[PDB]
Amino acid sequence: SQVFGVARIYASFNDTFVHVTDLSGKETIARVTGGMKVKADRDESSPYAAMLAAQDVAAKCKEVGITAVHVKIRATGGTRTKTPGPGGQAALRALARSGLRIGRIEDVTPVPSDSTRKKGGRRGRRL
Amino acid sequence: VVDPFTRKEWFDIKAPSTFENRNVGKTLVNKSTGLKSASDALKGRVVEVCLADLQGSEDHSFRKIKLRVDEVQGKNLLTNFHGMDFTTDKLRSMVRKWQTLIEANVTVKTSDDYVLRIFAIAFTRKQANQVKRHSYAQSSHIRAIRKVISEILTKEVQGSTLAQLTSKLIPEVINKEIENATKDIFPLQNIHVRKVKLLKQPKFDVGALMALHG
Amino acid sequence: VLVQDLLHPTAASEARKHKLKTLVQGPRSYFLDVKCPGCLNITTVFSHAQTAVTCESCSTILCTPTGGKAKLSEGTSFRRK
Amino acid sequence: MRAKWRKKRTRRLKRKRRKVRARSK
Amino acid sequence: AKRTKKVGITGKYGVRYGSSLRRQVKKLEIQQHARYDCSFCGKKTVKRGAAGIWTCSCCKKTVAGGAYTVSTAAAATVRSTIRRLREMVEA
Amino acid sequence: SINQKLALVIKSGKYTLGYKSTVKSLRQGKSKLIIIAANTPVLRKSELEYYAMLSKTKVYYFQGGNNELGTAVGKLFRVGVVSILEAGDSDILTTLA
Amino acid sequence: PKKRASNGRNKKGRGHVKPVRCVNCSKSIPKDKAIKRMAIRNIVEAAAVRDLSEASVYPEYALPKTYNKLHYCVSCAIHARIVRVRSREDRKNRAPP
RNA sequence: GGUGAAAUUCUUGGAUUUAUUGAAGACUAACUACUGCGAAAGCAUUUGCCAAGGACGUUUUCAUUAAUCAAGAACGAAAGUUAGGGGAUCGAAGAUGAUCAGAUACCGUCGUAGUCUUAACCAUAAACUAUGCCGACUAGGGAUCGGGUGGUGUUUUUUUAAUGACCCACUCGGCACCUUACGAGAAAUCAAAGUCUUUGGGUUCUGGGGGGAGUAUGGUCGCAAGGCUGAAACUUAAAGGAAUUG
Ligand SMILES: [Mg+2]
Ligand SMILES: [Mg+2]
Ligand SMILES: [Mg+2]
Ligand SMILES: [Mg+2]
Ligand SMILES: [Mg+2]
Ligand SMILES: [Mg+2]
Ligand SMILES: [Mg+2]
Ligand SMILES: [Mg+2]
Ligand SMILES: [Mg+2]
Ligand SMILES: [Mg+2]
Ligand SMILES: [Mg+2]
Ligand SMILES: [Mg+2]
Ligand SMILES: [Mg+2]
Ligand SMILES: [Mg+2]
Ligand SMILES: [Mg+2]
Ligand SMILES: [Mg+2]
Ligand SMILES: [Mg+2]
Ligand SMILES: [Zn+2]
Ligand SMILES: [Zn+2]
Ligand SMILES: [Zn+2]
């Protein structure tokens, strides 16, 4: 009933990414991250930020011509934490409650048929 | 002080034949400028859309489909096919402990000389009265299944193009043909064609491509 | 238990045991005369063949080798002696 | 001291005596 | 009667040049003087003469090869690889 | 396998090994099937092949060198061709070959 | 002295299983000694699901959990997750809840 | 970007993110379990080939051919060493950012060797069940793995069978768990660690207070690193084990 673009939220710890793009993917439309709405490093991934940035993104999204979207939420992954970080949670709500539409959202976290030695050595990151 | 928004040319995406709709969405390019244009440069891209969204019914929530643009004629850009996928969440659900996984694949050709690698997955099932709490098969069981899945997969492909193969997968005939030969070996549940990743096509051929639209 | 007749074990509890752990040991296989009514005569088979026993005149088949007990083939009759 | 650090302590010790002794070969 | 504990053909050099170089030579020397199987006639009668030239005693075919051994690891993989690449082109 | 067939022949039939004597056999309409080593040079192969066709004798291209053809026939030397003369108890003659 | 019949954890008749990497500190740890957990949870969350459905297309949609199996390193598994530490007896008990 | 927080770092080179496409080398996620196999080290994608094996079945065959083993030998995680290839990743060394009284570290970055493979070495690990092997006997219970037998068992339909998976009973041989203890033990615990002052089935190996010390020396193996063999003088009243209360 709308005009569909793609959402794609990368939301690891230390920062959260939101940016809508063409349903094909190639041509982007609007972005902004957590590290763009507060200055403190320490607070780069926290919900309160991903909010204020999911706000910014929604604005441009409907200022160019996208009325809706599908999201692909995603973590760091690879040979790392494979778990959803703090701010995708918030940003999802902050972009639906924005007054945009939602339709079909799968996780696209890179999960290998495992390997390439994980970092941090055999004894693990110890402290 | 630019804003490339007041600068990009707009397009609308039309899918191929054998589904419900073909109108899927919109896209942004750039002005068909002299030297590097809105034509040849891009368009030839790809689009993932849950085929339920282009089949209507929700008995198709999983199953992702790749559409690729090969031709374009005045704002109207027509796609054909690039592959098929599964939703990550679906798969991660039909894989449970206490049971056997079974995967098997084959690289194979079609009439319209497309090469493709197609996948298939299946899991053991408990008998409808089975007391023991796991149910795995017997490795000899597994070898036997795969060889027969493979027997049936090569059969379907080299059916008329991906075109009828496209028509073939959609009502998941294959899934049950498997389960038929199968039943003589070992129970099993789920059983899907899961994935297929294309990977080699012949030569453009404006004819046959145009022969998907009207 | 504590006092029982080891000398006269009951036929059942005796029967359920292993072929070597009976009182005095002995086999638990058997022989049979077998006929596939294409012919008229009766060839004597072993319940645990191994060899796929080739019938008398007509090289038809008869039984197939298995885990233990032979699988007799199709339309055939027998008797244990 | 850790056993294995002591095992290394004397591994080295023998190398020096192994050395100094060669001097006189 | 075993004549030498380890220098082998390399005993001609006496004490000279230092073990480790003699080691390295002894290898290719053994490689390079040896008698090899002939692809064409089947008898083991290929001997070297000047690097990369391998010839058959009877039957007399000469092959180019490694400086000290008939077939070279690289040459061989390259044989395997061309094979594979050729396969595509009529299949 | 084929060697297993060859073996039956070599232990219960009659045969001859080597270029010259199978030629005698081929001229003589006596060969029932000649067998040929891989590395046997193409000129020889071609000639045997011609001698063969002229005598309506069939031909097996043994995938393997003379060295192995020899071990095939159970002999500690190497043979480039074998000539089946009589097929002992084996079905070589009237199977896939 | 000894403190568990399962010694560390779960390997009777094998000699070598294979290390996994701790999900938290990346410590290597044998797969049988490994402390695991299925992190089956929704994509949305607590009260976000109302807002979810409401500002969506379709009716009610579907809603598919995330699934990912967790591996902890003992020290990590003790430091936060499942562990506590139990009495000498409560240790013996393998039932979960 | 990274962390408890930072910083070294990366950024008109459009970084980070996105998209299509490719190359390299490693790995085998999820399924994976108180589940399998192997002499042990160890072994998880598919497919073909090559030979190997236990258990079971057996009115087959030989007929004492066997048990265990100084000497001697095959194999032997990881690292390490030689000569090629490879060199994505992670990463002894080194260099840095930080922290610290200091900080040669823990944490962050760069990253040599290495990590992979071929042809040779090396022969060691808490190489662990810290528990030799062969044989007998002694006590209950529910699971599971492989084999076999029994069943007018269930389910698959087609037209009933035949299959296959499932269910129940028993029986061999597996990996384990439960409960008891006749019994054993310094206890913790133990179906062997039981059948021992009521002390003998067969056989191999090692220990004899603690340090000195796996040191010195000789021999031997190794390219090396090091392996195997391996003392004494002198010193010393304890060192040690399991359990209890603090
Ligand atoms: Mg800590
Ligand atoms: Mg001097
Ligand atoms: Mg204590
Ligand atoms: Mg303790
Ligand atoms: Mg071990
Ligand atoms: Mg796998
Ligand atoms: Mg010895
Ligand atoms: Mg001696
Ligand atoms: Mg490297
Ligand atoms: Mg340093
Ligand atoms: Mg400093
Ligand atoms: Mg230092
Ligand atoms: Mg040792
Ligand atoms: Mg242990
Ligand atoms: Mg018992
Ligand atoms: Mg049965
Ligand atoms: Mg005193
Ligand atoms: Zn008959
Ligand atoms: Zn020659
Ligand atoms: Zn950890």
Swiss-Prot record, chain B:
Signal peptide location: none
Listed GO biological process terms: cytoplasmic translation; maturation of SSU-rRNA from tricistronic rRNA transcript (SSU-rRNA, 5.8S rRNA, LSU-rRNA)
GO molecular function, one term: structural constituent of ribosome
Domain of life the protein comes from: Eukaryota
Cellular location(s): Cytoplasm
GO cellular component terms, semicolon-separated: 90S preribosome; cytosol; cytosolic small ribosomal subunit
Main location: cytoplasm
PTM characteristics: N-terminally acetylated by acetyltransferase NatA.
Keywords, in A-Z order: Acetylation, Cytoplasm, Isopeptide bond, Phosphoprotein, Ribonucleoprotein, Ribosomal protein, Ubl conjugation
Function in brief: Component of the ribosome, a large ribonucleoprotein complex responsible for the synthesis of proteins in the cell. The small ribosomal subunit (SSU) binds messenger RNAs (mRNAs) and translates the encoded message by selecting cognate aminoacyl-transfer RNA (tRNA) molecules. The large subunit (LSU) contains the ribosomal catalytic site termed the peptidyl transferase center (PTC), which catalyzes the formation of peptide bonds, thereby polymerizing the amino acids delivered by tRNAs into a polypeptide chain.
Homology family: Belongs to the eukaryotic ribosomal protein eS1 family.
General remark: Present with 92400 molecules/cell in log phase SD medium.
Annotated protein name in UniProt: Small ribosomal subunit protein eS1A
Species the sequence originates in: Saccharomyces cerevisiae (strain ATCC 204508 / S288c) (Baker's yeast)
Curated annotation (Swiss-Prot), chain C:
Keyword Transit peptide part of the UniProt annotation: no
InterPro entries noted in UniProt: Ribosomal_eS27, Ribosomal_eS27_Zn-bd_dom_sf, Ribosomal_zn-bd
Single GO MF descriptor: RNA binding
A cellular-component GO term for this protein: cytosolic small ribosomal subunit
Protein family according to the UniProt entry: Belongs to the eukaryotic ribosomal protein eS27 family.
Cofactor remark from the record: Binds 1 zinc ion per subunit.
Subunit and partners: Component of the small ribosomal subunit (SSU). Mature yeast ribosomes consist of a small (40S) and a large (60S) subunit. The 40S small subunit contains 1 molecule of ribosomal RNA (18S rRNA) and 33 different proteins (encoded by 57 genes). The large 60S subunit contains 3 rRNA molecules (25S, 5.8S and 5S rRNA) and 46 different proteins (encoded by 81 genes).
UniProt-annotated location(s): Cytoplasm
Top-level lineage group: Eukaryota
Cofactor: Zn(2+)
Modified residues (S-methylcysteine): C39
Pfam family, one: Ribosomal_S27e
The UniProt record lists the keyword Metal-binding: yes
Gene Ontology BP terms: maturation of SSU-rRNA from tricistronic rRNA transcript (SSU-rRNA, 5.8S rRNA, LSU-rRNA); ribosomal small subunit assembly; translation
Comment field (misc): Present with 43300 molecules/cell in log phase SD medium. There are 2 genes for eS27 in yeast.
Stored SUPFAM superfamilies: Zn-binding ribosomal proteins
Zinc finger (C4-type): 36-58
Keywords recorded for this protein, A-Z: Cytoplasm, Metal-binding, Methylation, Ribonucleoprotein, Ribosomal protein, Zinc, Zinc-finger
Protein name, UniProt field: Small ribosomal subunit protein eS27A
Organism, as annotated: Saccharomyces cerevisiae (strain ATCC 204508 / S288c)
Post-translational modification: The N-terminus is not modified.
Originating gene: RPS27A
Curated annotation (Swiss-Prot), chain D:
Coiled-coil ranges from the UniProt annotation: none
GO molecular function, one term: structural constituent of ribosome
Region (Disordered): 1-25
InterPro entries membership: Ribosomal_eS32 (IPR007836)
Name of the molecule in the record: Small ribosomal subunit protein eS32A
Something else known: Present with 11900 molecules/cell in log phase SD medium.
Main subcellular location of this protein, as a coarse class: cytoplasm
Subcellular compartments: Cytoplasm
Encoding gene per record: RPL41A
Subunit structure: Component of the small ribosomal subunit (SSU). Mature yeast ribosomes consist of a small (40S) and a large (60S) subunit. The 40S small subunit contains 1 molecule of ribosomal RNA (18S rRNA) and 33 different proteins (encoded by 57 genes). The large 60S subunit contains 3 rRNA molecules (25S, 5.8S and 5S rRNA) and 46 different proteins (encoded by 81 genes).
Recorded family membership: Belongs to the eukaryotic ribosomal protein eS32 family.
Known role: Component of the ribosome, a large ribonucleoprotein complex responsible for the synthesis of proteins in the cell. The small ribosomal subunit (SSU) binds messenger RNAs (mRNAs) and translates the encoded message by selecting cognate aminoacyl-transfer RNA (tRNA) molecules. The large subunit (LSU) contains the ribosomal catalytic site termed the peptidyl transferase center (PTC), which catalyzes the formation of peptide bonds, thereby polymerizing the amino acids delivered by tRNAs into a polypeptide chain.
One of the protein's GO biological processes: cytoplasmic translation
Keywords for this protein: Cytoplasm, Ribonucleoprotein, Ribosomal protein
GO CC term (a single one): cytosol
From Swiss-Prot, chain F:
Cross-link (Glycyl lysine isopeptide (Lys-Gly) (interchain with G-Cter in ubiquitin)): K14, K45, K75
InterPro entries, per the entry: Ribosomal_eL30-like (IPR039109), Ribosomal_eL30-like_sf (IPR029064), Ribosomal_eL30_CS (IPR022991), Ribosomal_eL8/eL30/eS12/Gad45 (IPR004038)
Note in the entry: Present with 59300 molecules/cell in log phase SD medium.
GO CC terms in record: cytoplasm; cytosol; cytosolic large ribosomal subunit
A GO BP entry: cytoplasmic translation
The family this protein is said to belong to: Belongs to the eukaryotic ribosomal protein eL30 family.
Entry keyword set: Cytoplasm, Isopeptide bond, Ribonucleoprotein, Ribosomal protein, Ubl conjugation
The protein's name in its UniProt record: Large ribosomal subunit protein eL30
TM annotation in the entry: none
Any one GO molecular-function label of the UniProt entry: RNA binding
Entry coiled-coil feature ranges: none
Cell compartments where the protein resides: Cytoplasm
Subunit organization: Component of the large ribosomal subunit (LSU). Mature yeast ribosomes consist of a small (40S) and a large (60S) subunit. The 40S small subunit contains 1 molecule of ribosomal RNA (18S rRNA) and 33 different proteins (encoded by 57 genes). The large 60S subunit contains 3 rRNA molecules (25S, 5.8S and 5S rRNA) and 46 different proteins (encoded by 81 genes).
Name of encoding gene: RPL30
Organism of derivation: Saccharomyces cerevisiae (strain ATCC 204508 / S288c) (Baker's yeast)
